[PDB]
Write a protein that binds this ligand. Structure first.
Ligand SMILES: [Ca+2]
Ligand SMILES: [Ca+2]
Ligand SMILES: [Ca+2]
Ligand SMILES: [Ca+2]
Ligand SMILES: [Ca+2]
Ligand SMILES: [Ca+2]
Ligand SMILES: [Ca+2]
Ligand SMILES: [Ca+2]
Ligand SMILES: [Ca+2]
Ligand SMILES: [Ca+2]
Ligand SMILES: [Ca+2]
Ligand SMILES: [Ca+2]
Ligand SMILES: [Ca+2]
Ligand SMILES: [Ca+2]
Lengths: 74, 80, 98, 99, 80
DNA sequence: CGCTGGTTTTTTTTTTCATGTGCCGGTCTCACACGTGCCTGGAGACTAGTAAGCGCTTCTAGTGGCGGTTAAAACGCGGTAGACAGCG
DNA sequence: TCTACCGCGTTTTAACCGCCACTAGAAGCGCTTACTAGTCTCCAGGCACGTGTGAGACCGGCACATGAAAAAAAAAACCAGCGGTAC
């Protein structure tokens, strides 16, 4: 139903509290709860995070790859 | 409450501590009781069998000692 | 409000009980358990007090040993906490089980 | 375009194959050399019934196959699929084969 | 000397396969050789000891069978 | 704009390929099976010597139950460290 | 990330103990006699040595399991283009 897994992440990380970062499994849980979602959503949010990490728009504060904590444009 | 419950959590904890265990899952205490029971069943069964063969109604230390040797768990300091 | 970190007392306990040799199961509850199990094989059986003590020595010995082996199985799985599957492995490898 | 089996698929095939069979899996001569060599250390100019050497081999292969079973379990118990020396050592320690 | 190398990687692999092993660390092949050697040392030592006691110079199957029984590794089919 | 529809991508599926394993019908070889004659070990019957069963005695131990202490268990509390699961 | 294990403090439990009295039953003595050994004989059933026959072990081949890589279909993640809105 709900689009822009990009807009989905941004809306879940907005809602998520001012942190050093925001970790996938805490965002994956928010998006699955708040919007009409599928199963492969867990595996699409994983591809959604990596394209936002890629575009400089999101950046990761701790960890590496797509297990760790991610921050926005400052 | 079967006498098996008389083998208290804290008692098992103690045995494990002598075994050099630091942290113990909750499930272990029942699991241990189960094992301990099988052990005693097997040992006593044999012990009693020795008793019956000696046409006695009193289980002797030796009856146990002989039983433990059979089970390959030789015990020093109770005779034999 | 003095509090010891989880594990610090555990260690203390270990050192204490390894140092000592006294039986760690309460004598009466054990003795009841023995007689109870014996009943299943033959009724109205008497026990030398020494025979019951022998059984306890052998039992505690056995378990202490089993825990050592269990502990190793836990660590071998990069755990510090023993679990039923640790015991089961130890008994399987010992040829006690299956 | 060549044909390749994924790593492990042949391993499985091998397992099924050798479990099915009973034939000794060590080459008979190299073993027999190893036996005589070890025997020298206990007594020199020793002869062996051929049956005695075969008995030793049966017992050895049996022993190891068994040890591997136990080792395999120790590997899996550590959430691994690959046996390693520490798997064997654990198995032997628990068996009371070594301290 | 050192026929221990005659126990080839592929042979060990075979034994492990019968043991239901799927994947095998490189280090295992030397480790296995070490174990196999200790096994044979212990069995043969005893076997030869039986031979010497029988004032023989030829190790019999029975010499091995008796040795394996002693070691708790009873073997059927060589005159047990 | 918010929609919405169709299409781009990610999943699952079907498929095709290939390969290897299992099976039958026909074939050779050798270990099974049996059969001989001979030997040894079994059974036999007898005699005597002994071990053990049975009853009697003794004596011991082991059992049951006494007061009440004080230690241990047991409960629930609250807070971390570790189980664990995923990623790369 | 999540909780289930530890380590803490109060409420409940019961084991331990140092003692006694009473008995079943362990243990030990003397009798009997029933059993087992240990002898001389007789004998056949089981051993080795040696025969020949059928089973299984082998072969090839063709049919069946399988796993792998490839073609096809489905499910779901998105661009436009649009109608509709107020400019
Ligand atoms: Ca019963
Ligand atoms: Ca009962
Ligand atoms: Ca009675
Ligand atoms: Ca009674
Ligand atoms: Ca001579
Ligand atoms: Ca056929
Ligand atoms: Ca053949
Ligand atoms: Ca958990
Ligand atoms: Ca809690
Ligand atoms: Ca006849
Ligand atoms: Ca005949
Ligand atoms: Ca024959
Ligand atoms: Ca035939
Ligand atoms: Ca748009």
């Amino acid at each position: 139903d709900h689009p822009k897994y990009s807009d989905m992440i941004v809306a879940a990380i907005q809602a998520e509290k001012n942190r050093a970062g925001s970790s996938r499994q805490s965002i994956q849980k928010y998006i699955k709860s708040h919007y009409k979602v599928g199963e492969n959503a867990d595996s699409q949010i994983k591809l959604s995070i990596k394209r936002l990490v890629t575009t400089g728009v999101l950046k990761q504060t701790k960890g590496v790859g797509a297990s760790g904590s991610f921050r926005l444009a400052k | 409450r079967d006498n098996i419950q008389g083998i208290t959590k804290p008692a098992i904890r103690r045995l494990a501590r002598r075994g050099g265990v630091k942290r113990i899952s909750g499930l272990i205490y029942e699991e241990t009781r189960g094992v301990l029971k099988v052990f005693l069943e097997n040992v006593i069964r044999d012990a009693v069998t020795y008793t019956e063969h000696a046409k006695r109604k009193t289980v002797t230390a030796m009856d146990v000692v002989y039983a433990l040797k059979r089970q390959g768990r030789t015990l020093y300091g109770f005779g034999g | 409000p003095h509090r010891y970190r989880p594990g610090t007392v555990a260690l203390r306990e270990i050192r204490r009980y390894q140092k000592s040799t006294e039986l760690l199961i309460r004598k009466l509850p054990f003795q009841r358990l023995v007689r109870e199990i014996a009943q299943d094989f033959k009724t109205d059986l008497r026990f030398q007090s020494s025979a019951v003590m022998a059984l306890q020595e052998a039992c505690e010995a056995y378990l202490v040993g089993l825990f050592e082996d269990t502990n190793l199985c836990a660590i071998h799985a990069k755990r510090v906490t023993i679990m039923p599957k640790d015991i089961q492995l130890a008994r399987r490898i010992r040829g006690e089980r299956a």
